[PDB]
Amino acid sequence: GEIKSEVREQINAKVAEWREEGKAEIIPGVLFIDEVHMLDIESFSFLNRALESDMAPVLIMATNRG
Amino acid sequence: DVTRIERIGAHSHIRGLGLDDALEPRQASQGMVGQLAARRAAGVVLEMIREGKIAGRAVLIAGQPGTGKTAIAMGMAQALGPDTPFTAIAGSEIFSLEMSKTEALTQAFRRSIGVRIKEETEIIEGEVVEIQIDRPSKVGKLTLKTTEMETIYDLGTKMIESLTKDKVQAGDVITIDKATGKISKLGRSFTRADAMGSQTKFVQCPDGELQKRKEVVHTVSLHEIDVINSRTQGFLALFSGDTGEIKSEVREQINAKVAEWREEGKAEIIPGVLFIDEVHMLDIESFSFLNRALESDMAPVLIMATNRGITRIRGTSYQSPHGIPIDLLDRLLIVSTTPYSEKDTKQILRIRCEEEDVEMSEDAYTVLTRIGLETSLRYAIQLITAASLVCRKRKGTEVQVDDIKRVYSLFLDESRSTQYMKEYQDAFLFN
Amino acid sequence: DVTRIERIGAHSHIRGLGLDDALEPRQASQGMVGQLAARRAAGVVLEMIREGKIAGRAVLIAGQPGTGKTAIAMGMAQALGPDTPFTAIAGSEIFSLEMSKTEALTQAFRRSIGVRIKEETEIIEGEVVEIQLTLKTTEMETIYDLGTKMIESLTKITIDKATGKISKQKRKEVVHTVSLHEIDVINSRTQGFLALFSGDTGEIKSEVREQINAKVAEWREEGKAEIIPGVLFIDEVHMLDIESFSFLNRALESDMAPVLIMATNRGITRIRGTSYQSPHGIPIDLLDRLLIVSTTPYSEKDTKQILRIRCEEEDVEMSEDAYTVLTRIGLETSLRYAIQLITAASLVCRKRKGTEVQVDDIKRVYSLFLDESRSTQYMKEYQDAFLFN
Amino acid sequence: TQRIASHSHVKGLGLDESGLAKQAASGLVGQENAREACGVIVELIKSKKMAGRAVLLAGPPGTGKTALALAIAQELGSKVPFCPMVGSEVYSTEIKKTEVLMENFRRAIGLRIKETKEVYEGEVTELTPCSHVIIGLKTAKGTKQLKLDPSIFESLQKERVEAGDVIYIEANSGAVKRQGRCDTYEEYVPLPKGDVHKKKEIIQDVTLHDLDVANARPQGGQDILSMMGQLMKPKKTEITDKLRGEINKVVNKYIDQGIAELVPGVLFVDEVHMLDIECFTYLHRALESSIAPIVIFASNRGNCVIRGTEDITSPHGIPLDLLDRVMIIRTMLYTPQEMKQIIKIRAQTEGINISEEALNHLGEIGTKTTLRYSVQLLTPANLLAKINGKDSIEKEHVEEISELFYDAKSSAKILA
Amino acid sequence: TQRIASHSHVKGLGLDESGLAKQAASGLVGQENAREACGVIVELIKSKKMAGRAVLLAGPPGTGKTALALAIAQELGSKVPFCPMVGSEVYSTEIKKTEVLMENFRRAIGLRIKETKEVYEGEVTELTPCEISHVIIGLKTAKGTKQLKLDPSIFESLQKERVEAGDVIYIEANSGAVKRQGRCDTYATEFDLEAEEYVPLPKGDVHKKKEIIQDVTLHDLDVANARPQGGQDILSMMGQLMKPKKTEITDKLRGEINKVVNKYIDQGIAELVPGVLFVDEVHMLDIECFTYLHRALESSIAPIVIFASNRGNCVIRGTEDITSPHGIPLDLLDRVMIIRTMLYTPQEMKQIIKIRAQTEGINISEEALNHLGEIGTKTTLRYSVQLLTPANLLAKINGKDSIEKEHVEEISELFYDAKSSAKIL
Amino acid sequence: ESPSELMLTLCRCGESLQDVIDRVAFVIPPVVAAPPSLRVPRPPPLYSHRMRILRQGLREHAAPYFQQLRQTTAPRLLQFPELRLVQFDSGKLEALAILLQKLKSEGRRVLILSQMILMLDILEMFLNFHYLTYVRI
Amino acid sequence: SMFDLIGLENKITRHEAELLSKKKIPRKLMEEISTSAAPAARPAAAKL
Ligand SMILES: Nc1ncnc2c1ncn2[C@@H]1O[C@H](COP(=O)(O)OP(=O)(O)OP(O)(O)=S)[C@@H](O)[C@H]1O
Ligand SMILES: Nc1ncnc2c1ncn2[C@@H]1O[C@H](COP(=O)(O)OP(=O)(O)OP(O)(O)=S)[C@@H](O)[C@H]1O
Ligand SMILES: Nc1ncnc2c1ncn2[C@@H]1O[C@H](COP(=O)(O)OP(=O)(O)OP(O)(O)=S)[C@@H](O)[C@H]1O
Ligand SMILES: Nc1ncnc2c1ncn2[C@@H]1O[C@H](COP(=O)(O)OP(=O)(O)OP(O)(O)=S)[C@@H](O)[C@H]1O
């Protein structure tokens, strides 16, 4: 339930540190939100800024709405 | 003279359903007068409940306010008697922060099915005369005593540990479960009670056989079994109510195990009645669940009461006859209550005055009956006690029409209060 | 300079109500200018709080935005001092996932009443390094018997003469003021005092609250405690529900009720949780229990004096022409906007290697930063580009 | 020294011995008919024969509904449990509104337990065990040596008693407490009745809700695993109806045995209009119950929309079917003379001396704005009078305090 | 290598000494007025004496508001706490949104605390307890051997780590933390095969005291003291088994921590570095959150707050009918300084596209750059910069090392923008 | 009874899930505090006795599981520089690793000559990284 | 304590409770017990 933001910042910093020190290699994956029209405005607003991070995957969304 | 927790309530005078063995409602019997057709229908449904053959039959009691629906329900509960589960809830009680409305309805259903489980235990009880040196792998002797027998038992390691852990002492009455080797100390010897006194309790020596077969019948409900099996210490939820959405798999396992016991003759299923007063307060989701919860083989008889006209179902914009979806109305039989004539209102008031233990003049009865016909039955019932108090303050033995007029002027009914409000409505907040 | 946790906030200049002994408000004093009638009303309310005899009195500070209602509240808090409880919340803070709105308001009410308890301890100890116990001091030398093992830790200071409590030259007396909320959170659990910090208190039961009220009344009668009635300040009270307001109605009728100060800046609006319109977003039944103090919009000279006080609070020197330009701006846009222009213009002058804020600095800051009206106009001009109009 | 509340002047209903209302008595002026109704329902509560009877005090704001309920409470005394409540209190994040209502019903029924409590005290433990425990107790007045159980011995060890540490030990429970370690050999017992064998008749008042919550979870640190129950947050739960029935049965047993007395009390629901339709619908069945208390509702609403319905308007914000089962007491507006009487009563209660012309001007202000506003000006006006060296409130002070503070109507006009 | 994000090109505000914005510098082009205002705000944050000052970045989407906020962050540097936040993050399932806002306020205030660290490290020569008030432990390094009397807590942590003898351990006295980092090197030769790892014995002193600077925020102190993790008493240990939920930290804990921090500042062992809280999509906050921000910005402890909103006359969330300029209540707009971002000319868009191409390592021909600028004028700036990577991929598929116009045309045909998609809808 | 399994992995298709946790478990709280204490002058005897009874009883109940109770609930207050950073910080050690592994397989022995004592300490660390036994002169 | 129903779950069963109710030392026998002398007539072991 609601992993702390500072914990995630620490994870990110240590993963970058691992990458610089030859331990870790980052594999960016794909997040597929099927029926993305079921998200509300708040979720879309978060998605806007969640995509600005360097640890953000490629996002595929599908929707039949018009 | 002495006040108990139960005292004069609204329905305390309904001792049962006043109908013959032919299910013909007597005009006035068991504290219930009038509503002949609805009482006959209630008798038929009561016989259905007593036979316990048909599962998930739903009955709706409909009618105007003050027409006796809860009176008929309480009469059914009083004729049914204890040891047949009659669960009474309001439709509001299912909206809980603990669990979903579906879960609450499921618990209410599981609470209306009663299980009588019998077991044989084969225990040993006796006053302990001696426990001797176990120092050797430890081995010891235990001497047990009834008023007719005493025997000496050779103790294994586990029994020795149990006896030393309970600090079993010479001169106390224990019971030993042979299957489990479980020691229960229930009292101290009859050779003292002789200067003691503490958490201890004093018991006289058992008489008869040291070893006794015993049949104990345990009465539980399906809900109780569910919450006992829900978690390791789940029986505490029978007290706190902290049940939290018992798993469906647990309920299926319990249903299967109960069916096994019933085939084995171990368990006896007593199906009961779930009474939901004010069923119009349920959501369309709850009615949808009731549609299917009734179609289970372990479903009780569902009785619901509603005074609604043609209202919108809660959670929807749809107008349905009793605030209940039409698919659920097809699944039930509707008992309708006719309003009360002057004779019926007078009889009801007489029975209520008998319950209150208040004596009223005949002119007072006429005036109060007219007041009830004008205003409402419940208002007249309340005026009964109010006028009794006003009479007592007057140092009179019989309530007169003057006292009824006094309490009528002191206490308003809905219509007169609404009128006084209406002429002053600019002084009241929000219209 | 060293940056402390307390920095230059909006109301840092306010040291209290600038009030005479007759409660008459000085034109400018203790960081507050103008609002003579409102300041006088706050002074009489403050005398009511200090007297502390009448329980559950409610005062509402009403006026246009930026008229100093929160400033009057902070001045009242500064005048009241740290020894009487002053609980400040926003109307939004009662909407909690831990507790109901009723519980949040109850806790806020019980955080404003303080019980003062003075205890006599026993402390004589001093300069000792020896081991068994004998003690020596510049004026004292003593021996003490002992029949317990606590001395082992004491070896490696001062002790209680009564119970022998050990901790690293006379009886001395200690005063502790404890709020009712602290008392019932400490006594709600085995380690309930932790919930005073974590907030994991979760709807203290009415039973314990009743018992603690009874015990506090007993202590008051027996002289062991005295009640220090405080004041609860609810800023932006229009965020409360109709349920919250109805609770406040009868919460104020306890003898353990603090003095309630509420601030609101809206006219006849909808009460939250209802479709009804009421003068302050507050139901009329609660307004019935309130004394309402209204704040007048500031004049030109009052605005200039406020700007002067804020400038000397922020330690920025401006020219007189800059003061007149900024006063015109404040009268044209808002007081808060000018207050912020002060800091921005000080920064612009600093980049310039200047020492005094000139009119050109204020013009530059006015160009860089917009008020609501100018931004709204530029928005209207680009209406289509913006989202969801 | 205690503080003056809004209802601190309400000492009772102020009725004569025939039940009629004195014009002004025990802090109440006017509302004679409502007061007489409150008196008859006080007699109803003291009769303790009727359960789940409901009374609604309906009238404009400020007409003394809450004052009348508090007067009823005063007329009953602290013997009878008076549970005050607001309709907003049913909305809890922990339990459902129905559980909150049921609990408040539980705590409006009181139980009075009579016990003859025996205890053994003294300088104590002049002996510890001379199969048995022998302890000598000396308390100035004398000394007794008594024989205890071995179980009392284990409890005594648990309490780490030593020879010379005053203790409690009760014959009715076997519970033991070492009250002190008076360093004479840190507290020693007094000597009014400083006997070793102490027994006196005790009465403790407990509500049925207290019994329910006591039986809701284990008793805490005594048991192996209930010790970890003390580390939990004290969440309130939906006490099952079966537990209530069982507690009722045991309470009835002990009422029959004559050691307990049933004192049913009053549940006062102020701002009943804040309950939603679910709460009222439950209240139907809660009032049908024979184990329910006497319930007093108060509403100032004119034709409000019932909460939780969004469309349905009923007279007092209360559903019609609930109004059908309650008795209505009508509170009316106050004449200016009654307002003057009330202002004088409040001034006297607050220790405020008021001149005659000041009282008349304040009564005029109240007739213009409202009774509450005029009652509120008293303390600030007294403070102003004290500032200006006076001990009586004069017309100038009330004028100045009226100019400093506004009523709802004046503020609304400024806002419009 | 490092992954390229949508803002990786912004390295600052590109302002000269006098604060005037260079047309293109530090990865930013245009928005000179907004960049200059942001430079003023950077100076405000560096001044460090003003608390609770809020700025609002207002302009249509695509105008660079988040870019300017991150440019401010770059200007400040990693030393100053920059807490980014979105309005949608307040709606937590565990704590009230007011608590989330206050926590974000508290983690935008940073502390640099100099702490003396007491270290015991060495080979365990002996471990002798005394009834259990003591443990006598001998520690051996290259410098020498010492035996120390340590608390029962350290002994019982040593039992947790299971250190017996010949084990190299690291004890931090402050936290009571024991680390068994292996067995001594001298015991490697004992056996051909042993189931542990050998570490050389420490070469320093047994008892080392070290001064270190710790970077923490006020929120770190609040959370540590509201969910205590130090201390070895059983009561706190059993509380550690609870699910670590976020709790509504009370104002009393924050006041106590304020007192502690003030004491540290007086003692010279701490320095306050108040930072900035960046709430993007502030329009997502409901009326309750804005009305709380009213109070949260009056606090003398508050950080600098930056808001960004692209909405024109949106209804305030939670109000259901109240239209305010930027989705933000007017009473809050009275507390902020508004920095407006303007739309871009075709030339500025072309410059931005070239900068993004440079950052993504993509060679684009002049024809392709002009065509992509034309597309961006027709569609949007965001659409054009997104075409660059797919166009480069197609160019590599064709075997060319630069993006020609045909690749841009192909990618334009394969993908659509919101306007074309809306047309076909 | 009920079923159960350990064959369940997390993301790797591999080892015993405590090695996984150890591999990825590195965060330390920025601040660690002992629980706040209630500073009461002369606490009441009943309260102190109750607290003592509770603490004593909770212990001797967790005593059978005290070691487990502590492995859990023990925060990570320290994270050390991992041993692999040696030999990654230096290219000399990176080449020496290959050289020494080859020399080990070939059976030869080695003596490493370095002027710096401190680099000898670093070499001790590096040799332990490769499980190579040595003597220091 | 007589209203402590939850505690009794750890202690006894209903058959045990019915047993106890039937077997509780009657009042008369209590005074008989407290009057009479100790009947210490144990025949001692025989091993026949
Ligand atoms: N024979 C009777 N039939 C109906 N009500 C009776 C009868 N005798 C007494 N009453 C009383 O009449 C009142 C009417 O209430 P009920 O109708 O039984 O309950 P209810 O839940 O309100 O159902 P309603 O009013 O029809 S919606 C109660 O106080 C009953 O105790
Ligand atoms: N106490 C007051 N005295 C005089 N005018 C007031 C007062 N309170 C509010 N107003 C007026 O109300 C206007 C708007 O107030 P706000 O608090 O910003 O929003 P509002 O009053 O709720 O209005 P809306 O549009 O109905 S939400 C102010 O600009 C004032 O003109
Ligand atoms: N008849 C009365 N005699 C004396 N004081 C009264 C009387 N009625 C009301 N008061 C007092 O006048 C003030 C306002 O009356 P309240 O009792 O608080 O309001 P209420 O009528 O009880 O409840 P509301 O306002 O109608 S919802 C309080 O201080 C009361 O104690
Ligand atoms: N003046 C600028 N110079 C350089 N890059 C810019 C400029 N303005 C915007 N960008 C960038 O162009 C892309 C889109 O701008 P963003 O700032 O991410 O979105 P946005 O339009 O600022 O968000 P909002 O809040 O709706 S304005 C990002 O890669 C930014 O870095």
Side-chain angles (χ1 to χ4, degrees), chain B residues 4-8 11 92-93 197 238 240 314 356 376 378 382 385 406 412 421 429, chain D residues 36 48 50-51 53 147 149 237 240 252 256 278 281 285 288 292 300 302 324-325 328:
Chain B
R4 324 175 68 71
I5 276 169
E6 304 90 352
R7 48 215 197 276
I8 311 305
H11 305 307
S92 321
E93 309 213 40
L238 282 315
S240 63
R314 289 197 77 215
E356 307 311 343
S376 87
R378 311 216 190 91
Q382 297 178 323
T385 51
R406 175 42 171 189
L412 318 183
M421 173 175 122
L429 295 204
Chain D
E36 290 161 21
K48 64 159 75 90
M50 305 304 313
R53 287 304 185 84
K147 200 167 185 186
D149 303 33
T237 59
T240 62
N252 265 346
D256 284 335
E278 289 164 12
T281 302
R285 202 178 77 84
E288 300 315 80
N300 52 26
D324 190 39
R325 45 169 52 77
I328 313 272

Coordinates of all heavy atoms in Angstrom, one line a residue, chain B residues 4-8 11 92-93 197 238 240 314 356 376 378 382 385 406 412 421 429, chain D residues 36 48 50-51 53 147 149 237 240 252 256 278 281 285 288 292 300 302 324-325 328:
Chain B
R4 N -36.8 -5.6 34.3 CA -35.9 -6.4 33.6 C -35.3 -5.6 32.4 O -35.7 -4.4 32.2 CB -36.5 -7.7 33.1 CG -37.5 -8.3 34.1 CD -38.2 -9.5 33.5 NE -37.3 -10.6 33.3 CZ -36.7 -11.3 34.2 NH1 -37.0 -11.1 35.5 NH2 -35.9 -12.3 34.0
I5 N -34.5 -6.2 31.6 CA -34.0 -5.5 30.4 C -35.2 -5.4 29.4 O -35.3 -4.4 28.6 CB -32.8 -6.2 29.8 CG1 -31.5 -5.7 30.5 CG2 -32.7 -6.0 28.3 CD1 -30.3 -6.5 30.1
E6 N -36.0 -6.4 29.3 CA -37.2 -6.4 28.5 C -38.3 -5.8 29.3 O -38.7 -6.2 30.4 CB -37.6 -7.8 28.0 CG -36.5 -8.5 27.3 CD -35.6 -9.3 28.2 OE1 -35.8 -9.2 29.4 OE2 -34.8 -10.1 27.7
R7 N -39.0 -4.7 28.7 CA -40.1 -4.1 29.3 C -41.1 -3.8 28.1 O -41.0 -4.4 27.1 CB -39.7 -2.8 30.0 CG -38.7 -1.9 29.3 CD -37.7 -1.3 30.3 NE -37.0 -0.1 29.7 CZ -36.0 -0.2 28.9 NH1 -35.4 -1.3 28.6 NH2 -35.5 0.9 28.4
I8 N -42.1 -2.9 28.4 CA -43.2 -2.7 27.5 C -42.7 -2.0 26.2 O -42.4 -0.8 26.2 CB -44.3 -1.9 28.2 CG1 -44.6 -2.5 29.6 CG2 -45.6 -1.9 27.3 CD1 -45.0 -4.0 29.6
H11 N -44.4 -4.1 20.5 CA -44.9 -5.3 20.1 C -44.9 -6.3 21.3 O -45.1 -7.5 21.0 CB -44.2 -5.9 18.9 CG -44.2 -5.0 17.7 ND1 -45.3 -4.4 17.2 CD2 -43.1 -4.5 17.0 CE1 -44.9 -3.6 16.2 NE2 -43.6 -3.7 16.0
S92 N -31.4 -1.4 6.6 CA -30.2 -0.5 6.8 C -29.0 -1.2 7.3 O -27.9 -0.7 7.1 CB -30.6 0.7 7.7 OG -32.0 1.1 7.5
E93 N -29.2 -2.3 8.0 CA -28.1 -3.0 8.7 C -27.1 -3.6 7.7 O -26.1 -4.1 8.2 CB -28.6 -4.0 9.7 CG -29.7 -3.5 10.6 CD -29.7 -4.2 12.0 OE1 -28.5 -4.5 12.5 OE2 -30.7 -4.5 12.5
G197 N -10.3 -19.4 49.4 CA -11.2 -18.6 48.7 C -10.4 -17.7 47.7 O -9.5 -16.9 48.2
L238 N -17.5 -13.7 16.6 CA -18.8 -13.9 17.1 C -19.1 -12.8 18.2 O -20.3 -12.6 18.4 CB -19.1 -15.3 17.7 CG -19.3 -16.5 16.8 CD1 -20.3 -16.1 15.7 CD2 -18.0 -17.0 16.3
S240 N -16.9 -9.6 18.7 CA -16.6 -8.3 18.2 C -17.3 -7.9 16.9 O -17.6 -6.7 16.6 CB -15.1 -8.2 17.9 OG -14.6 -9.1 16.9
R314 N -33.9 2.0 -4.7 CA -32.7 2.7 -4.3 C -31.5 2.3 -5.2 O -31.4 1.2 -5.7 CB -32.4 2.3 -2.9 CG -33.3 2.8 -1.8 CD -32.7 2.8 -0.4 NE -31.7 3.8 -0.2 CZ -30.6 3.6 0.5 NH1 -30.3 2.5 1.1 NH2 -29.7 4.7 0.6
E356 N -50.0 -2.1 29.1 CA -49.5 -1.0 29.9 C -49.9 -1.1 31.4 O -49.3 -0.6 32.3 CB -50.0 0.4 29.4 CG -49.7 0.7 28.0 CD -48.3 0.5 27.6 OE1 -47.4 0.4 28.4 OE2 -48.0 0.4 26.3
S376 N -53.6 8.5 13.8 CA -52.8 7.3 13.5 C -53.0 6.4 14.7 O -53.3 6.8 15.8 CB -51.4 7.6 13.2 OG -50.6 7.6 14.4
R378 N -50.4 4.5 16.1 CA -49.3 4.7 17.0 C -49.4 5.9 18.0 O -49.1 5.8 19.1 CB -48.0 4.8 16.2 CG -47.8 3.7 15.1 CD -46.4 3.3 15.0 NE -46.2 2.4 13.8 CZ -45.9 2.9 12.6 NH1 -45.7 4.2 12.4 NH2 -45.8 2.0 11.6
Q382 N -49.4 5.8 22.1 CA -48.5 6.7 22.9 C -49.3 7.5 23.9 O -49.0 7.7 25.1 CB -47.6 7.5 22.1 CG -46.6 6.7 21.2 CD -45.8 7.5 20.3 OE1 -46.2 8.5 19.8 NE2 -44.5 7.1 20.2
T385 N -50.1 5.8 27.4 CA -49.2 5.9 28.5 C -49.1 7.4 29.0 O -49.0 7.6 30.2 CB -47.8 5.4 28.1 OG1 -47.4 6.0 26.9 CG2 -47.8 3.9 28.0
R406 N -56.1 16.3 27.7 CA -54.9 17.0 28.2 C -53.6 16.6 27.5 O -52.8 17.4 27.1 CB -54.8 16.8 29.7 CG -53.5 17.3 30.4 CD -53.1 18.7 29.9 NE -52.0 19.2 30.7 CZ -51.6 20.5 30.7 NH1 -52.2 21.3 29.8 NH2 -50.7 20.9 31.5
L412 N -48.6 16.7 20.1 CA -49.2 16.8 18.8 C -48.9 15.6 18.0 O -47.9 14.9 18.2 CB -48.6 18.1 18.1 CG -48.5 19.4 18.9 CD1 -48.0 20.5 18.0 CD2 -49.8 19.7 19.5
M421 N -46.2 24.3 12.3 CA -45.0 24.6 11.4 C -45.4 25.5 10.2 O -44.7 26.5 10.0 CB -44.5 23.3 11.0 CG -43.4 23.3 10.0 SD -42.8 21.6 9.8 CE -43.1 21.5 8.1
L429 N -35.9 26.4 9.7 CA -34.8 26.4 8.8 C -35.1 25.6 7.6 O -35.6 24.5 7.7 CB -33.5 25.9 9.5 CG -33.0 26.8 10.6 CD1 -31.5 26.5 10.8 CD2 -33.2 28.3 10.4
Chain D
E36 N -44.4 21.4 30.4 CA -45.3 20.4 31.0 C -45.2 19.1 30.3 O -45.2 18.0 30.9 CB -46.7 20.9 31.0 CG -47.0 22.1 31.9 CD -48.2 22.9 31.6 OE1 -49.1 22.3 30.9 OE2 -48.3 24.0 32.0
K48 N -39.8 4.0 34.2 CA -39.0 2.9 33.7 C -39.7 1.7 33.4 O -39.3 0.5 33.6 CB -37.9 2.6 34.8 CG -38.4 2.1 36.1 CD -37.3 1.3 36.8 CE -36.3 2.3 37.4 NZ -36.7 2.7 38.8
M50 N -41.7 1.8 30.1 CA -41.8 1.9 28.7 C -40.5 2.0 28.0 O -39.6 2.7 28.5 CB -42.6 3.1 28.3 CG -44.0 3.2 29.0 SD -45.0 1.8 28.7 CE -44.8 1.5 26.9
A51 N -40.3 1.2 26.9 CA -39.1 1.1 26.2 C -39.3 1.7 24.8 O -40.3 1.5 24.2 CB -38.5 -0.3 26.1
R53 N -39.7 4.6 23.5 CA -40.6 5.7 23.2 C -39.9 6.9 22.8 O -38.9 7.3 23.4 CB -41.5 6.0 24.5 CG -42.5 4.9 24.8 CD -43.4 4.7 23.6 NE -44.5 3.8 23.9 CZ -45.7 4.1 24.5 NH1 -45.9 5.4 24.9 NH2 -46.6 3.2 24.7
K147 N -5.3 -17.1 56.3 CA -4.9 -18.2 55.5 C -5.4 -18.0 54.1 O -6.6 -17.7 53.9 CB -5.4 -19.6 56.0 CG -4.6 -20.8 55.5 CD -4.9 -22.0 56.3 CE -4.1 -23.2 55.8 NZ -4.4 -24.5 56.5
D149 N -5.2 -19.1 49.6 CA -5.1 -20.2 48.7 C -3.6 -20.1 48.1 O -2.9 -19.1 48.2 CB -6.0 -20.0 47.5 CG -7.5 -20.0 48.0 OD1 -7.7 -19.5 49.1 OD2 -8.3 -20.5 47.2
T237 N -15.9 -1.9 16.8 CA -16.4 -3.0 15.9 C -18.0 -3.1 16.0 O -18.6 -2.4 16.8 CB -15.8 -4.3 16.3 OG1 -16.2 -4.7 17.6 CG2 -14.3 -4.3 16.1
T240 N -21.9 -8.0 17.7 CA -22.9 -8.8 17.2 C -24.2 -8.8 18.0 O -24.1 -8.5 19.2 CB -22.4 -10.3 17.0 OG1 -22.1 -10.8 18.4 CG2 -21.2 -10.3 16.2
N252 N -30.1 -9.9 33.0 CA -31.4 -10.3 33.6 C -31.3 -11.3 34.7 O -32.0 -11.2 35.7 CB -32.3 -10.9 32.5 CG -33.2 -9.8 31.9 OD1 -33.4 -8.8 32.4 ND2 -33.8 -10.2 30.7
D256 N -32.6 -10.5 38.5 CA -33.5 -11.4 39.2 C -32.8 -11.7 40.6 O -33.5 -11.8 41.6 CB -33.8 -12.7 38.4 CG -34.8 -12.4 37.3 OD1 -35.6 -11.5 37.4 OD2 -34.7 -13.2 36.3
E278 N -31.4 5.9 5.8 CA -31.0 4.6 6.4 C -31.1 4.6 7.9 O -31.6 3.7 8.6 CB -29.6 4.2 6.0 CG -29.5 3.8 4.5 CD -28.0 3.9 4.0 OE1 -27.1 3.9 4.9 OE2 -27.8 3.8 2.8
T281 N -34.7 4.7 9.1 CA -35.3 3.4 8.8 C -34.9 2.4 9.9 O -35.7 1.6 10.4 CB -34.9 2.9 7.4 OG1 -35.4 3.9 6.4 CG2 -35.6 1.6 7.1
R285 N -37.0 0.1 13.7 CA -36.9 -1.2 14.4 C -36.2 -1.0 15.8 O -36.5 -1.8 16.7 CB -36.1 -2.2 13.6 CG -36.3 -3.7 13.9 CD -35.6 -4.6 13.0 NE -34.2 -4.7 13.4 CZ -33.7 -5.4 14.3 NH1 -34.4 -6.2 15.0 NH2 -32.4 -5.4 14.6
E288 N -38.9 -0.1 18.0 CA -39.8 -1.3 18.2 C -39.2 -2.2 19.3 O -40.0 -2.9 19.9 CB -40.0 -2.1 17.0 CG -40.6 -1.4 15.8 CD -41.8 -0.5 16.2 OE1 -41.6 0.6 16.7 OE2 -42.9 -1.0 15.9
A292 N -35.1 -0.9 24.4 CA -34.6 0.4 23.9 C -34.9 1.5 25.0 O -35.7 1.3 25.9 CB -35.3 0.8 22.6
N300 N -35.0 21.8 14.0 CA -35.3 23.1 13.7 C -35.7 23.3 12.2 O -36.0 24.4 11.7 CB -34.2 24.1 14.0 CG -32.9 23.7 13.4 OD1 -32.8 23.0 12.4 ND2 -31.8 24.1 14.1
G302 N -37.6 23.2 8.6 CA -39.0 23.5 8.2 C -39.6 22.5 7.3 O -40.6 21.9 7.7
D324 N -44.7 9.2 12.6 CA -45.9 8.5 13.1 C -45.7 7.8 14.4 O -46.7 7.6 15.1 CB -46.3 7.5 12.0 CG -47.7 6.9 12.3 OD1 -48.6 7.7 12.7 OD2 -47.9 5.7 12.1
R325 N -44.5 7.5 14.8 CA -44.2 6.8 16.0 C -43.6 7.7 17.1 O -43.1 7.2 18.2 CB -43.3 5.6 15.8 CG -42.1 5.9 14.8 CD -41.1 4.7 14.8 NE -41.8 3.5 14.5 CZ -42.2 3.1 13.3 NH1 -42.0 3.8 12.3 NH2 -42.7 1.9 13.2
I328 N -44.8 14.7 19.5 CA -44.3 16.0 19.1 C -44.5 17.0 20.2 O -45.6 17.2 20.7 CB -44.9 16.5 17.8 CG1 -44.9 15.3 16.7 CG2 -44.1 17.7 17.2 CD1 -43.7 15.3 15.9

